[model samples]
Target: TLDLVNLGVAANFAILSKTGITDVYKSAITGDVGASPITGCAILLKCDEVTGTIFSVDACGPACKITDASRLTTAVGDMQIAYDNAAGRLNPDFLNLGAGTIGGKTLTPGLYKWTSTLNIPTDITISGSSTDVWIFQVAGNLNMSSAVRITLAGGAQAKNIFWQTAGAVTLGSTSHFEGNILSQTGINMKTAASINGRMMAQTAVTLQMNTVTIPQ
Candidate 1:
C-alpha cells in the first residue's frame, strides 16, 4: 500500500508538474508549485501571487528565478513516485462503475474504477467520515460539465480523496472540484475553476484564473 502519510516533501506541494505549468492571469495557488525539464513557463506564473514557494530545476528558463535545483529534482522524483503509486492501486472496491454519468449519486469511501469515460453533469455527493479514503481510477478521460460540482459531506476531507486517471482530465469552466488527481497526461483546468486538492500531472497543467488550495 502507498502510505498517504509518506508523500514526503511532494505532499507539501499543491501543484506538481513534470513538464511545465502554464497559467492565465492571476491564478491563486495556496501551496507550492514546482516543475522540471521545461521551465520557461514555470516562471511565467507570478511568484508574488502564489501564497507558497515556486521552484524549478535546470535553470528556470528565460525568467531568471528559482535557484533551488536539487530540491526541485527531488520534488519531481516524488511526484513521479506518487503518480506510479496511484496508478498501481489495484482491486478496486467498485469496478467498471459510474453508469456513464455520476449525478446525484451518493458515494461512500472506497476504491472505484471506470473503464470508460466519466461525466459529471450535476452535483455528486461523497459522504464519508474524516478518516475515510476514496480512490477513483479512471482509465479514460474525466469530464466535468460546466458549473458542475462534486459535493463532499459528512465530515469528508479532501486529503483522503484520490483520482487516478490514465488519460487527460478537464474541469469545466467555473466548476468546483475536489480530490488529488494523478494524471498520466495533461490536466486542463478551465476558466475560474476552483479546486480544493492537488493536481499532479505527468505532462502539463494548464490553469486559468483558478483558485487552487491544498487540503489541510
Candidate 2:
C-alpha cells in the first residue's frame, strides 16, 4: 500500500530544530517554530515581523521566549521522530534522478532517492493531485539555487511533498520552495527565500529574510 508517513504532533510546527541554536532574522513564518530539549542552544530569533509562535529550551532563558513552552517541547520530539522515519524510507520508485541534479523538469508524484548531492538550478514543476505524495530521499546535501521556483499544478498540495535529506539542506536566495523538509543536519535559508511547508531539521536552522507559510 502506498502511504504517506505520519508526522503526528509535528504537523503543528512549521519549523523544528533539535539543534541548540536557531538563528532567524527578518523572516515571517505563519506557523509554530520550535527548538528545544537541548540546553544552551539558543533560539536567537528576530521574528517580530512574523506571524508564528517562537519557543526554545529552558536553559535559553530569555532567548527561549515563547508562550507555549510545553507544546513546543512535545512538538520537537515529534519532529525528530518524523525526521528519522522519512530519512530512513525504503523502496524508492526512482533512484539517483538527474544524477543528484534535478532541474527544469515536470515531476510526477512518487518516491525518489539520491545517493549524493541534490541540486536544483532552475524551475521545477510538481504536477499532481492534492492527495498525491512525493518523497525525495537525499543521502547528501540538498541545494536549490537562487530564484528557483517549485511550480505546482493539477491540484498539487505543498503538504504532500516531502524532502528527506541525511545531510545539510540549503535554499538559495529569493528561491521559492514547496514541501516539508526533513533534514538530518542543518538547514540554511538565504535571503528572501520562501517556503510553503515545514522545515524540520535535526540540527540548527538558519533563516535570513525568509518566509515560511503553512500549506493548507
Candidate 3:
C-alpha cells in the first residue's frame, strides 16, 4: 500500500501541470473542460516517449476532478512538490508533481490501470503559472472520500469530471465531489453528496444516496 499523504500530494501536482496553459479555452481542448458535455480530453504522459491513458471519473467537466485512489505506483519516479515562480505563484505548499508534457493531445475518457510506476516531475506549471487556468485530464478510475476537496485554479467555470473508459468507477462512502462524472461502464456514488457537474455513464449509474441528481 502507498501512503495516502504522499499520494495526495503527488496527484495534486499531476493535475496542476497538465492544466497549466496560456489560453483557458485551449486548455479545455487538451483536457476535459469543466462543466461541459465533452466526455474526455487528451492526457499525455511523458516516459521515454509520450505514453497515453484514458481516465474515467466524475466532477471533471466544468471544473477539475482531483481523484483519490487507494494505491498508486511510483516506480517511474517518486512524487514530489516544487515551487512555481511565475505571474501567479501559488503558495509555498503548492502540491506539484508528474513528468513531461501533458495534454497537447486528446484521450477518450475511460478506466485504465497503471502498468508501471508513475513519475511526477518538478516545476510543472498550468496557465503560465499565473495568467492561465489549469485543467487536469484523467484516463482512469477516480476514487474520492467525503473529506477530499477538489479545488480549481483561477476561478474558472465548473466542469464535469470525465471518465471515458470501459471500466466501472467507484465512489467511496461519504465521498463528496464537485465536478461532473462521465464513465463508459457505470458510476457508484456510495454516499449522499453534492456534485456541481453531471453524471453520464454508458451503463447504469448507482447512487447509494438520493442526493445525487441525474442530468435531465
Candidate 4:
C-alpha cells in the first residue's frame, strides 16, 4: 500500500529516446505567430513511446528545456531487489518480507522479481522521488495479499509510475493502485478498485468486480 501523492514525475519524454526535439511557447502552435505575449519559458518533455528514431512526446513543462534531440540511452540502474530462481520462488539473497517504503526515489522502470512475499503497509507510497523518471520494475509478482490499500497520492499526472513485468501481477481486493501498469503477461484485479493508471498488459487483464480508471 503506497501513498502516491508525494512521488515525482517518472521518466519524461526528453529522457526516453535519442534525436528528438521538444518546444514550448507562450501560445499554442498556430500556423504562424506575431509579437507574442508569451515570455520565453522552459519545460520538460516526457516520452511515451520509443521507436527507431521517433519518440513520442508528453509535456512536463516548467522545469526543463526543449531541444532538437534527447536519448533514452541511459544504462539501467542497479536492481532494488532480485531473485535467482524461477518465478514464484524465493532467493535468500534478496528477499524482503517486512514492510517496505519506496517514496522519495527516482526508480528506473524495468522488471523486478521478489522471492519472498511483499508486505506493503497502508501508508506505503511508491512514487517518483524526483522530476521525470520511470519508477518500477516488477519481474515476478507483487504478492500484495497483506497489502490493503495502494494510494495514488499524486494529483492525476501521466506516467507517474510504470509497473512493468513479465509475469502475472495480482492486486489484492480493494487494493488501490496509483500509476500506469504495463505488463508482458497479464493483470488480475481482485475486487472493487480504483487504479489511477493505464493497464497495458500483453496477455489478458481481468477486472473482477472493480472499476479501472484512466486519464482522458
Candidate 5:
C-alpha cells in the first residue's frame, strides 16, 4: 500500500503517443501534446485545438508546433518506464473484478488486476484520499460504454489513478473518464468523450472531437 507510481518527465504532457495522435476534427487539449519515434507529421492536432504546446521532432506536424526532439525523446522513455512499472506490479488487491466488467462499482485505493478485456457498461465511482493510489493492470483491451462516467470522491485525485493496458483502449461516445491511461497499444476516444487525466499510449491516439485535460 505504500507504493506510489510516478510518471517522471512524462507527467509534463497531457497526451503522449509513440506512433502519433490523430484528431478527426476540432478537439480541445488542455496540456502539452506530443508524439515521437514517428515524424511530427503524424501528430494531427492543429495549434488552435490545443491550449498548451505541441511538441514535435520537426516543424512538420502542426503549423505552430515546436521542434524539441530531445524533450520528446526523454518523455517517451519515461512514459515507457511508467507503463512497465504499472503493468509489472504483482499481487493485486482485486483480481478480475466483475470478470473484467467493472461498472456501477465503488473502488477504493489499491492495485487491481484483470486477465481479459475490461468493460465499463455503466457509471463507476472511485473513492479515496488524494494520496491514495489506484493501479489497474489489464492484460487485454478496455472498453467503456457510451455516456458512462467515472466519478471520484473522498478527495480522490485523477493523478493517483493509473490504468495500464496491454491491448487497445476505447472510450465510447460522451463517456467521461478520469485516470492516467498507460496503454501498450492504441487509444481511441469516440465523439464527445471527455477525460480528466493523461493518455500515454505506446501506439497511436485517435480522437474524435474529444476533450482531454491533464489532472493536477
Candidate 6:
C-alpha cells in the first residue's frame, strides 16, 4: 500500500496558493487561506467570505488578513514537498484509468496514475473505509463536467484522498469534489461548485461563489 503523503504546514490551509487567489463573489471558505510570494492584494476574497484566518505575506489581502511571511513561506514549501511526494509514488494499482475519462466509475483505495488529461463527464464513487487512502497522479490537466460529483461511500473520507496533478485543475459548475488537490498549476472552481478538501496550488486558485471546506 502507498503511504499517505505528509502535508506538514500546508495542511493548515484549506486554500494555499503560491501566486494568488481570486474569488468572484460571496464564496464560503471554511478553513485557513493563505498566499505566498505574492502581494496580498492578489488574494481577493473578501473578509466576510472566509470563516478562518487569512495569511498573507503583506497586509493588503482581505480586511481580516494577517501579515505572516514566515508562516506562508513554510506552508508553501511543505505544499511543494507534499505534491512531489504524491506524484512520485511507484507502481500504481490502476494506470490511465478509463483512458483518462473516468466519469461514471467506482474507484477503491489505491494509487491511480494517468499520463494524459483526466475528464469526468459524470459522477463517480469512491468506496473505502475511513482509514483507506487514495492517490491520483495526473500528468495533464483535470477537467470535470458540470453537475458531476465524487461521492464517498462506506466510510471513505475526503481527507484520505489526494490528487496530484502536473497541470491545471478545473472543477465543473455546481459539481462537488472530494480530496486534497496538489496542483502544479492553477485550480479553478466554477460557479457554485463545492469541495470537501484542501486546494494547494503552485500557481493560483480561482473561485466563483464556491464553497470550500477542510476535510473532516
Best-to-worst TM-score order: 6, 5, 1, 2, 4, 3
lDDT of 4 by residue, 20-93 (tens): 22222111111101010111121122222111122222332232322221221211010111111112232222
In the range 63-136, model 3's lDDT, one tens digit per residue, is: 23332222212200222221111112223221222232221222122222222222211111121222222222
Would you give me the overall lDDT of model 2?
A: 0.81
Q: Provide the overall lDDT of each model, using Cα atoms, as 2-decimal numbers.
A: 0.80, 0.81, 0.29, 0.36, 0.94, 0.94
> How high a TM-score does candidate 6 get?
0.99
Cα displacement (Å) at residue 71, model 1: 1.7
TM-score of 4: 0.43
Runs of candidate 6 exceeding 4 Å displacement: none
Candidate 2 on 1-216: residue-level lDDT in tens? 346867887898787777744445567888877776655345666547446666665645333366556776778778777777777778988999888778998889888899899999999999999799988889899999999999999988998998998999999999999999988889899999999998888888888888889888
Give the clashing pairs for model 6.
Answer: none
Off by over 4 Å in 3: 1-137, 160-163, 213-216
lDDT of 1 by residue, 79-148 (tens): 7777777677777778766576787788898878888887888889989888888888888998898898
- lDDT by residue (62-166, candidate 5, tens digit) is 888999999999999999999999999988999999998988999999999999999999999999998899999999999999999999999999989999999
Return the TM-score for candidate 3, rounded to 2 decimals.
Answer: 0.36
lDDT of 6 by residue, 133-152 (tens): 99999999999988999999
lDDT of 4: 0.36
lDDT value, residue 92 of candidate 2: 89
- Name the regions of candidate 5 deviating beyond 4 angstroms: none
